Structure 1
């Protein structure tokens, strides 16, 4: 045989991220002394779009805490942010869209985005356009907050983790039909080399498990085991069920 395409993509090679036109990574600001004890006030300077990302980015200007200079941050903007707006980050900050607060200060039932799973990681959950988390409950004895995630799972995080109030901008992006092959071409031009996709039954046996035969067919079940080696693990990996889903649709992911 020969190497399968899914394994080849792990070498890097011509399948890496197209990043030349991107701005930097998008993060909250660093969890420093001012954020742990007081608050900081910044000004929104511009709202921009970057290739490959559905949400809008905001450049926010703060004063440096120790030196005489200005510091520019790049964040994922919530819906409603505008140029000239004042943004408050820290322990004592008011409940308003765009402010950044410790999770332990946000009242239950509030909608948040840009949540950090562990304190000080500068935001890792609920970042794609139109997404958000819901705050369910606090626990003061153990200092932990419960959240409902975009996928529908529940997660417990330390109450010192930060989050921005609001919803990621740019929502409703997937409801417009694409209609053309060229539109898909332009969509993936800004992301990476992964389109168009050739079906495995259309290939030859030398290069895929599904290939070959005098008809186009898989001659063996397409549900494969969790323990299969790379090159054998194609199809429906470790599926608990297959076919059309009737009635309630369960929460995906691991238990």
Structure 2
């Protein structure tokens, strides 16, 4: 609730103790229940896998990209949005990407991202048609609706 993007619950094994760890990822479109998700430097280029930015060739579409190494995802997290990898600078270990706003950013090549587009896109294509629809939309987001015009006060 409050999110246009669906979330995926993915279960991993703990490498050091006998326990299951459930992670909450932002679901990329095409990810299914029972799918194997591979995360790491040596992960393969498959939809839903989590890879460092340097391991992805130019033109790779990626989502939930880390702004800084290990922050677990900052960029391109809303439904239908994604990040395009523009190019690499291996000498400085840096990668150039294009953000959903159209801005180009330089990130460490060790930063991670999830291959694909965030699911739920095209949500904005439909009119809300009613004040009640917006009421229910913001009922699980925050108290920012409705807005009185300052010129009317």
The two structures have a TM-score, normalised by structure 1, of 0.59
Q: In the TM superposition, what whole-angstrom CA distance separates every residue of 1:116-148 from its partner, at most 9, and x where no partner exists? A: 011000000000000001001101111110001
**Of 105, 115, 122, which residue of structure 2 is paired with 1:172?**
122
Residue of structure 2 in register with 1:86 after alignment:
36
Residue of structure 2 in register with 1:135 after alignment:
85
Please report how far the alpha carbon of residue 109 of structure 1 lies from its aligned counterpart in structure 2 after TM superposition. Answer: 1.0
1:195 aligns with 2:145: yes
Residue segments in structure 1 that go unaligned for 5+ positions in a row: 1-50, 204-255
Pairwise mapping of residues 1-255 of structure 1 onto structure 2 (< 5 A)? Answer: 51-203=1-153
Residue segments in structure 2 that go unaligned for 5+ positions in a row: none
Q: In the TM superposition, what whole-angstrom CA distance separates every residue of 1:233-253 from its partner, at most 9, and x where no partner exists? A: xxxxxxxxxxxxxxxxxxxxx
Please report how far the alpha carbon of residue 95 of structure 1 lies from its aligned counterpart in structure 2 after TM superposition. Answer: 0.5
- The structure with the larger Rg is 1
Cα-Cα RMSD: 0.6
Q: How many residues align?
A: 153
Partners of 2:57 and 2:37 lie apart in 1 by 19
Residue of structure 2 in register with 1:20 after alignment:
none
Please report how far the alpha carbon of residue 187 of structure 1 lies from its aligned counterpart in structure 2 after TM superposition. Answer: 0.8
Partners of 1:106 and 1:56 lie apart in 2 by 24
Residue of structure 2 in register with 1:9 after alignment:
none
Q: Give runs of ≥4 in structure 1 deviating > 6 Å.
A: none
Please report how far the alpha carbon of residue 177 of structure 1 lies from its aligned counterpart in structure 2 after TM superposition. Answer: 0.7
